[PDB]
PDB file of C-alpha atoms and ligand atoms in Angstrom:
ATOM      1  CA  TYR A 299      23.408 104.136 -43.846  1.00  0.00           C
ATOM      2  CA  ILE A 300      24.962 103.536 -47.254  1.00  0.00           C
ATOM      3  CA  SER A 301      26.711 100.421 -45.928  1.00  0.00           C
ATOM      4  CA  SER A 302      24.882  97.251 -46.921  1.00  0.00           C
ATOM      5  CA  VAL A 303      26.778  95.325 -44.241  1.00  0.00           C
ATOM      6  CA  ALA A 304      25.563  97.786 -41.611  1.00  0.00           C
ATOM      7  CA  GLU A 305      21.920  97.573 -42.656  1.00  0.00           C
ATOM      8  CA  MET A 306      22.328  93.807 -43.002  1.00  0.00           C
ATOM      9  CA  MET A 307      22.622  93.668 -39.213  1.00  0.00           C
ATOM     10  CA  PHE A 308      19.686  95.987 -38.543  1.00  0.00           C
ATOM     11  CA  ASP A 309      17.602  93.911 -40.957  1.00  0.00           C
ATOM     12  CA  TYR A 310      18.449  90.652 -39.188  1.00  0.00           C
ATOM     13  CA  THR A 311      17.166  92.172 -35.946  1.00  0.00           C
ATOM     14  CA  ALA A 312      13.892  93.237 -37.556  1.00  0.00           C
ATOM     15  CA  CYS A 313      13.448  89.732 -38.964  1.00  0.00           C
ATOM     16  CA  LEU A 314      14.219  88.207 -35.568  1.00  0.00           C
ATOM     17  CA  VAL A 315      11.920  90.680 -33.812  1.00  0.00           C
ATOM     18  CA  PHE A 316       9.326  89.779 -36.439  1.00  0.00           C
ATOM     19  CA  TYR A 317       9.278  86.231 -35.054  1.00  0.00           C
ATOM     20  CA  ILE A 318       9.919  87.003 -31.375  1.00  0.00           C
ATOM     21  CA  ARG A 319       6.616  88.887 -31.270  1.00  0.00           C
ATOM     22  CA  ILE A 320       5.048  85.497 -32.046  1.00  0.00           C
ATOM     23  CA  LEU A 321       7.156  82.925 -30.210  1.00  0.00           C
ATOM     24  CA  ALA A 322       7.489  84.951 -27.011  1.00  0.00           C
ATOM     25  CA  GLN A 323       3.712  84.635 -26.606  1.00  0.00           C
ATOM     26  CA  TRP A 324       3.934  80.867 -26.100  1.00  0.00           C
ATOM     27  CA  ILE A 325       5.284  81.645 -22.635  1.00  0.00           C
ATOM     28  CA  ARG A 326       1.705  82.697 -21.905  1.00  0.00           C
ATOM     29  CA  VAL A 327       0.637  79.118 -22.646  1.00  0.00           C
ATOM     30  CA  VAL A 328       3.319  77.915 -20.231  1.00  0.00           C
ATOM     31  CA  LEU A 329       1.800  80.004 -17.436  1.00  0.00           C
ATOM     32  CA  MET A 330      -1.706  78.713 -18.134  1.00  0.00           C
ATOM     33  CA  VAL A 331      -0.424  75.138 -17.968  1.00  0.00           C
ATOM     34  CA  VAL A 332       1.738  75.609 -14.876  1.00  0.00           C
ATOM     35  CA  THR A 333      -1.102  77.432 -13.134  1.00  0.00           C
ATOM     36  CA  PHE A 334      -3.531  74.688 -14.164  1.00  0.00           C
ATOM     37  CA  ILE A 335      -1.249  71.915 -12.891  1.00  0.00           C
ATOM     38  CA  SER A 336      -0.730  73.546  -9.491  1.00  0.00           C
ATOM     39  CA  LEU A 337      -4.495  73.513  -8.947  1.00  0.00           C
ATOM     40  CA  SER A 338      -4.752  69.843  -9.916  1.00  0.00           C
ATOM     41  CA  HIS A 339      -1.926  69.043  -7.503  1.00  0.00           C
ATOM     42  CA  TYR A 340      -3.735  70.809  -4.660  1.00  0.00           C
ATOM     43  CA  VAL A 341      -7.079  69.142  -5.376  1.00  0.00           C
ATOM     44  CA  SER A 342      -5.689  65.660  -5.997  1.00  0.00           C
ATOM     45  CA  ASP A 343      -3.683  65.919  -2.760  1.00  0.00           C
ATOM     46  CA  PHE A 344      -6.486  67.514  -0.748  1.00  0.00           C
ATOM     47  CA  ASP A 345      -7.348  65.953   2.584  1.00  0.00           C
ATOM     48  CA  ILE A 346      -9.796  63.043   2.719  1.00  0.00           C
ATOM     49  CA  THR A 347      -9.903  60.647   5.680  1.00  0.00           C
TER      50      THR A 347
ATOM     51  CA  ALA B  70       1.035  62.252  21.763  1.00  0.00           C
ATOM     52  CA  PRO B  71       4.677  62.244  20.634  1.00  0.00           C
ATOM     53  CA  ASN B  72       5.541  62.049  16.974  1.00  0.00           C
ATOM     54  CA  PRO B  73       5.808  58.351  16.062  1.00  0.00           C
ATOM     55  CA  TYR B  74       9.353  57.092  15.737  1.00  0.00           C
ATOM     56  CA  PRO B  75      10.405  57.369  12.070  1.00  0.00           C
ATOM     57  CA  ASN B  76       9.339  54.351  10.024  1.00  0.00           C
ATOM     58  CA  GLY B  77       9.944  54.210   6.287  1.00  0.00           C
ATOM     59  CA  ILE B  78       7.328  51.517   5.712  1.00  0.00           C
ATOM     60  CA  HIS B  79       4.319  52.894   3.862  1.00  0.00           C
ATOM     61  CA  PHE B  80       1.693  51.802   1.359  1.00  0.00           C
ATOM     62  CA  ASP B  81       0.746  53.803  -1.726  1.00  0.00           C
ATOM     63  CA  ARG B  82      -2.728  54.124  -3.227  1.00  0.00           C
ATOM     64  CA  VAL B  83      -2.700  56.409  -6.293  1.00  0.00           C
ATOM     65  CA  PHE B  84       0.957  57.147  -7.032  1.00  0.00           C
ATOM     66  CA  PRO B  85       4.352  56.463  -5.421  1.00  0.00           C
ATOM     67  CA  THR B  86       5.022  59.178  -2.856  1.00  0.00           C
ATOM     68  CA  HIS B  87       8.584  58.184  -1.884  1.00  0.00           C
ATOM     69  CA  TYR B  88       7.790  58.882   1.753  1.00  0.00           C
ATOM     70  CA  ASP B  89      10.833  59.866   3.805  1.00  0.00           C
ATOM     71  CA  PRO B  90      10.190  59.969   7.575  1.00  0.00           C
ATOM     72  CA  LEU B  91      13.334  62.101   7.985  1.00  0.00           C
ATOM     73  CA  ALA B  92      12.249  64.877   5.608  1.00  0.00           C
ATOM     74  CA  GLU B  93       9.634  66.372   7.944  1.00  0.00           C
ATOM     75  CA  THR B  94       9.567  67.124  11.652  1.00  0.00           C
ATOM     76  CA  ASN B  95       5.965  66.081  12.312  1.00  0.00           C
ATOM     77  CA  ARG B  96       4.418  63.235  10.346  1.00  0.00           C
ATOM     78  CA  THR B  97       1.791  64.531   7.938  1.00  0.00           C
ATOM     79  CA  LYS B  98      -1.650  62.982   8.213  1.00  0.00           C
ATOM     80  CA  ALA B  99      -2.439  59.959   6.059  1.00  0.00           C
ATOM     81  CA  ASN B 100      -4.805  60.831   3.225  1.00  0.00           C
ATOM     82  CA  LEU B 101      -6.876  57.928   1.934  1.00  0.00           C
ATOM     83  CA  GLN B 102      -5.854  58.473  -1.693  1.00  0.00           C
ATOM     84  CA  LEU B 103      -2.165  59.124  -0.945  1.00  0.00           C
ATOM     85  CA  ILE B 104      -0.614  56.829   1.661  1.00  0.00           C
ATOM     86  CA  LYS B 105      -1.160  54.349   4.466  1.00  0.00           C
ATOM     87  CA  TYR B 106       1.467  54.183   7.181  1.00  0.00           C
ATOM     88  CA  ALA B 107       2.775  51.083   8.887  1.00  0.00           C
ATOM     89  CA  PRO B 108       0.927  49.715  11.917  1.00  0.00           C
ATOM     90  CA  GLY B 109       1.903  50.594  15.447  1.00  0.00           C
ATOM     91  CA  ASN B 110       2.441  54.341  15.531  1.00  0.00           C
ATOM     92  CA  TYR B 111       3.672  53.743  19.099  1.00  0.00           C
ATOM     93  CA  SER B 112       5.115  50.235  19.117  1.00  0.00           C
ATOM     94  CA  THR B 113       8.322  48.395  19.960  1.00  0.00           C
ATOM     95  CA  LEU B 114       9.847  45.056  19.003  1.00  0.00           C
ATOM     96  CA  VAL B 115       9.600  42.352  21.667  1.00  0.00           C
ATOM     97  CA  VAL B 116       9.754  38.572  21.848  1.00  0.00           C
ATOM     98  CA  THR B 117       6.818  36.659  23.315  1.00  0.00           C
ATOM     99  CA  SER B 118       5.736  33.056  23.754  1.00  0.00           C
ATOM    100  CA  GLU B 119       2.422  31.248  23.746  1.00  0.00           C
ATOM    101  CA  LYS B 120       1.273  29.537  26.924  1.00  0.00           C
ATOM    102  CA  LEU B 121       0.963  25.796  26.432  1.00  0.00           C
ATOM    103  CA  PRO B 122      -2.359  24.176  27.342  1.00  0.00           C
ATOM    104  CA  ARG B 123      -2.926  23.502  31.017  1.00  0.00           C
ATOM    105  CA  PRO B 124      -3.388  19.716  30.615  1.00  0.00           C
ATOM    106  CA  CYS B 125      -0.168  19.545  28.606  1.00  0.00           C
ATOM    107  CA  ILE B 126       1.601  21.386  31.429  1.00  0.00           C
ATOM    108  CA  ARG B 127       0.338  18.930  34.043  1.00  0.00           C
ATOM    109  CA  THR B 128       1.729  16.006  32.045  1.00  0.00           C
ATOM    110  CA  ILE B 129       5.121  17.730  31.944  1.00  0.00           C
ATOM    111  CA  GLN B 130       5.061  18.353  35.693  1.00  0.00           C
ATOM    112  CA  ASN B 131       4.212  14.701  36.328  1.00  0.00           C
ATOM    113  CA  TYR B 132       7.057  13.509  34.095  1.00  0.00           C
ATOM    114  CA  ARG B 133       9.725  15.626  35.788  1.00  0.00           C
ATOM    115  CA  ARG B 134       8.372  14.659  39.204  1.00  0.00           C
ATOM    116  CA  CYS B 135       8.425  10.956  38.370  1.00  0.00           C
ATOM    117  CA  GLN B 136      11.851  11.529  36.808  1.00  0.00           C
ATOM    118  CA  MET B 137      13.603  13.006  39.851  1.00  0.00           C
TER     119      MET B 137
HETATM  120  C1  LIG C   1     -16.971  82.259   5.860  1.00  0.00           C
HETATM  121  C2  LIG C   1     -16.217  81.140   6.579  1.00  0.00           C
HETATM  122  C3  LIG C   1     -15.133  80.555   5.672  1.00  0.00           C
HETATM  123  C4  LIG C   1     -15.697  79.356   4.911  1.00  0.00           C
HETATM  124  C5  LIG C   1     -15.391  78.065   5.667  1.00  0.00           C
HETATM  125  C6  LIG C   1     -15.878  76.876   4.845  1.00  0.00           C
HETATM  126  C7  LIG C   1     -15.315  75.583   5.419  1.00  0.00           C
HETATM  127  C8  LIG C   1     -16.057  75.252   6.707  1.00  0.00           C
HETATM  128  C9  LIG C   1     -15.741  73.820   7.128  1.00  0.00           C
HETATM  129  C10 LIG C   1     -16.843  73.326   8.063  1.00  0.00           C
HETATM  130  C11 LIG C   1     -16.501  71.921   8.553  1.00  0.00           C
HETATM  131  C12 LIG C   1     -17.402  71.528   9.722  1.00  0.00           C
HETATM  132  C13 LIG C   1     -17.730  70.030   9.717  1.00  0.00           C
HETATM  133  C14 LIG C   1     -16.517  69.184   9.333  1.00  0.00           C
HETATM  134  C15 LIG C   1     -16.714  67.756   9.836  1.00  0.00           C
HETATM  135  C16 LIG C   1     -16.374  66.742   8.743  1.00  0.00           C
HETATM  136  C17 LIG C   1     -14.902  66.788   8.347  1.00  0.00           C
HETATM  137  C18 LIG C   1     -13.993  66.386   9.508  1.00  0.00           C
HETATM  138  O1  LIG C   1     -14.444  66.016  10.538  1.00  0.00           O
HETATM  139  O2  LIG C   1     -12.609  66.440   9.336  1.00  0.00           O
HETATM  140  C19 LIG C   1     -12.137  65.298   8.686  1.00  0.00           C
HETATM  141  C20 LIG C   1     -10.693  65.493   8.241  1.00  0.00           C
HETATM  142  C21 LIG C   1      -9.855  65.840   9.462  1.00  0.00           C
HETATM  143  O3  LIG C   1      -9.868  64.748  10.335  1.00  0.00           O
HETATM  144  P1  LIG C   1      -8.508  64.405  11.196  1.00  0.00           P
HETATM  145  O4  LIG C   1      -7.398  65.329  10.761  1.00  0.00           O
HETATM  146  O5  LIG C   1      -8.087  62.982  10.925  1.00  0.00           O
HETATM  147  O6  LIG C   1      -8.787  64.615  12.807  1.00  0.00           O
HETATM  148  C22 LIG C   1      -9.037  63.492  13.603  1.00  0.00           C
HETATM  149  C23 LIG C   1      -8.875  63.875  15.071  1.00  0.00           C
HETATM  150  N1  LIG C   1      -8.929  62.680  15.891  1.00  0.00           N
HETATM  151  O7  LIG C   1     -10.644  66.513   7.284  1.00  0.00           O
HETATM  152  C24 LIG C   1     -11.098  66.123   6.016  1.00  0.00           C
HETATM  153  O8  LIG C   1     -11.182  64.977   5.732  1.00  0.00           O
HETATM  154  C25 LIG C   1     -11.511  67.177   4.994  1.00  0.00           C
HETATM  155  C26 LIG C   1     -13.031  67.147   4.882  1.00  0.00           C
HETATM  156  C27 LIG C   1     -13.479  66.478   3.582  1.00  0.00           C
HETATM  157  C28 LIG C   1     -13.158  67.359   2.378  1.00  0.00           C
HETATM  158  C29 LIG C   1     -14.216  67.137   1.302  1.00  0.00           C
HETATM  159  C30 LIG C   1     -13.956  68.054   0.114  1.00  0.00           C
HETATM  160  C31 LIG C   1     -15.293  68.543  -0.432  1.00  0.00           C
HETATM  161  C32 LIG C   1     -15.067  69.434  -1.649  1.00  0.00           C
HETATM  162  C33 LIG C   1     -15.726  70.789  -1.418  1.00  0.00           C
HETATM  163  C34 LIG C   1     -15.802  71.568  -2.727  1.00  0.00           C
HETATM  164  C35 LIG C   1     -17.242  71.890  -3.113  1.00  0.00           C
HETATM  165  C36 LIG C   1     -17.353  71.972  -4.633  1.00  0.00           C
HETATM  166  C37 LIG C   1     -18.504  72.897  -5.015  1.00  0.00           C
HETATM  167  C38 LIG C   1     -19.039  72.520  -6.393  1.00  0.00           C
END
């Protein structure tokens, strides 16, 4: 579109998307931690008498 | 054996568990590294008295007898 204000909005999305591709992957690190903690909680609380 | 009457007294080993005897129906087993429960799983509160020595009792009997 000839409107610079219109493209200005579509360009902000592309710049946001440019970073979301990166930051959204740190949720993978959250899973690996949460999954690693749940195992430690099961082992540390495992039965020993 | 019945579930022991709820008793909040407990002893921690590794970390504070915040044991609540009212949060579970059956009391979970005591793991060595987690908790030790209070003594007397099946116990009540009573009042008792020691029995004085026999020779001390005979001196008390002789005093009352000589008294009356
Ligand atoms: C294909 C089949 C599926 C595979 C099955 C594998 C597991 C088979 C288990 C076989 C156990 C048979 C012998 C067990 C006797 C010793 C343990 C025992 O007696 O239980 C103790 C106790 C229960 O006792 P109470 O609940 O108080 O009951 C008292 C009743 N008055 O249970 C326990 O303490 C758990 C046993 C100790 C766990 C030790 C953990 C060892 C870690 C193993 C991982 C190996 C890492 C490999 C590298």
